[PDB]
């Protein structure tokens, strides 16, 4: 039936994570920049009539990787496509976002479906097959569901989402990591213009001045489960997928041209199959690439399908994040889904950019659709959950469309750890920023998540806090190395002797168990940082807190490029 | 009634301790040497102690600079006295505030003059260090000093004025100025005994070397010259003691004579006459003098003799008296109760009667003493612990224990561990180990000394491990775990924790078999040189 999205991680132009992404969207920020010479020299390729676009939605630090975290030799890192490296990181972080760790994922029937469409690094070098790109994560975490790369060009990550959904419903897997990754590493590839690119370097979605897309980079992952399992497992749930479908354009006027009829059929069939009335939908994240013939075809298709069922006018907002971050290709779908989920969570619609005058080839006034250019509350009538769609179409003609529905749910001991001390310090900084930014965080949920939803690694710190202010001060104290009697920190390999007593002796265990049961948190904390395994469940009686989204591991930022 | 001797320590010519002393006596060794030029430039002979300058002032909370200003007589007795307590199995903790008297025989001031150093302070050193509360009295009755002290301590214990007494003597010969039978050769020495009422010693489960069943002191009075002896006074002394305390001369089988080798014939006649008043029996009582081995140890003479007698009783063995070829012309042995023993032989007793002996000590000032001693007749892995105030001394302690165990094939391992646990202060530098046999024990100590890794051996400096044992000191279930460990089996765990500084309740290791304290090697003091500043 319904598929729950229980974890996400995103890395897009101008946004190192989904929290920065959200902030940028709310503030209607455009992340497209001129291509710097550190990538390539546009002047050596630029011709205005060769490349005729000098702009890109770019990721920062595409060379950074933490190979030691993944048990990969540093020298092997140089030989890895950064698309592989970046997804390995984001994919991992999605799991941690959900509150799952290596221990809890071991032997899980989790499928991995990875959108990917380019091979630039591999060619530059003359391990880097699509097949291996997908298999990296399963190999690392010991997952047992199929690992499949999907190259349907720009629809890739949405197509993957469909396949994962069907495998989950058919009970072939019990979890799914779906995502996409796209980088533009060479003048040659980003180049193919074929007439595709805008000379102004913007995706002018829905606008009469639409004249092509600007290439964007991105890497995004989702964690999917059956809704029934997600509720039983007490996951935190971003939203639910209540319908999806994929099809083909077939014979068009040129293989990269779109088909109105196919787009209508896709959308109509989905709504009919899953009993979804177009009136129930209030936002659509369009493919919306800002191409002159593509935009009006998409608009006309969707409008027509909606109008078949309803006379209501201008009830459904449309937008495209490609207006913000460019066309992130294989990662386009996951970028779009993540926008909609964030919109749902905050009950807020955000502006679509670069829209001045409606495309002449489509009339909005008598349409169910309207272009939203406002930061405004996402209103819903009665009790009803918000519903949205995401479309993604590829140049090869393979189309995807999913329907997402809002999910409507019915002193603490803080522990942190990392594989190196430097990353532990980075972790504490990320948590401090997060708590600073999120004034309403549930302290018990957060602590519970750090306890049960993160792997205890070798470098540890812990502390007590009963308030946001106390929490922030503890982290500040830790970071500033200024003495605080409630802060504990150790390297586990150093302390083995100081812990053995509680591991072997019968009365010491019984003491430790009593400590945990009577909530003697200082004592539990001191021992935990030293490496003692704590049964966290014992900390909780009638009331158990819930896992929530927190910042994920802050990987070492080590530079690896061509050998 | 009876007084138990529950601790002893001794340092005599040729003997750094009471075990070497015994060995020397058994082998009829003579410790008299020519006086070297390092003492002074030269009678040219003396019974000398070795390294009289050596002291461990830090152990005793004394500034190293003060040590140079201390009479070495004070310093050496401080050490020997302390070791006597440890021999008995008592430590700083268990002695704190005890009503223990200190009676110290001392009769010279050489160092003070050469240069704090009063007799009054000499006696008070140990009480000050250990916080004892019985009177501290120095006794100068010349060569009878330590035996006079013994008498006074005995009377105080019987009157219940004190509950313990440290009695002792110390004599050094530091200057040329203060310095067959032909006179005596001067000897140096320091000795101490620990005394208790017998009833207390048995209730407290002390180990008991022997019991004092009679003692007396008196004066020569008017003699022909103040340093001459009085046959009559010696007789009266001995008779009065035997009569007061119901002691029949026939029961006595050894007498350690004053026996300075001058005097001799008067002592022989006196004792012989007193014995003969009560018995016709001939040549039943052996006589000797340890002054033939070690010289005339002066203030320490009494304690040296008492220790010889106790060692004899313990080993049920009589040892040779030396330098005897032909009897003194002025006394006829053949029809006497007395005979000079020159043999190493079994000390025989009839029908399981306890052996009895006497010690006589007579001073040049005319103050005499005589005491009567009776032999005392009493009715799995272990955890061995050692500690010292410096690592160097811990190493020396381990060596001393290994030698001791090597020399004593019949040591009770449980008793020894028990003594190391309860009868020594746990100090800052620690080692511990398990053993279930003599061989394992010796091996462990060897391994420790040779620095050969051994999984049964644990060692730590306590100041370094504080953070590591806190986990056990305050928490209730950690204590329960420790109590389960020590209540009871894992010993390895108790050992690891103990060396790190955790206080253990040694009693809990024992359900209703409890082992007994025994004599073991005492602290091996740092051997630092201090002399005139």
UniProtKB/Swiss-Prot annotation, chain B:
Compartment(s): Cytoplasm
Domain of life from the UniProt record: Bacteria
Domain Ketosynthase family 3 (KS3): 1-375
Active site: 143, 258, 296
Purpose: Involved in some intermediate steps for the synthesis of the antibiotic polyketide bacillaene which is involved in secondary metabolism.
Protein name (record): Polyketide synthase PksL
Organism: Bacillus subtilis (strain 168)
Record gene name: pksL
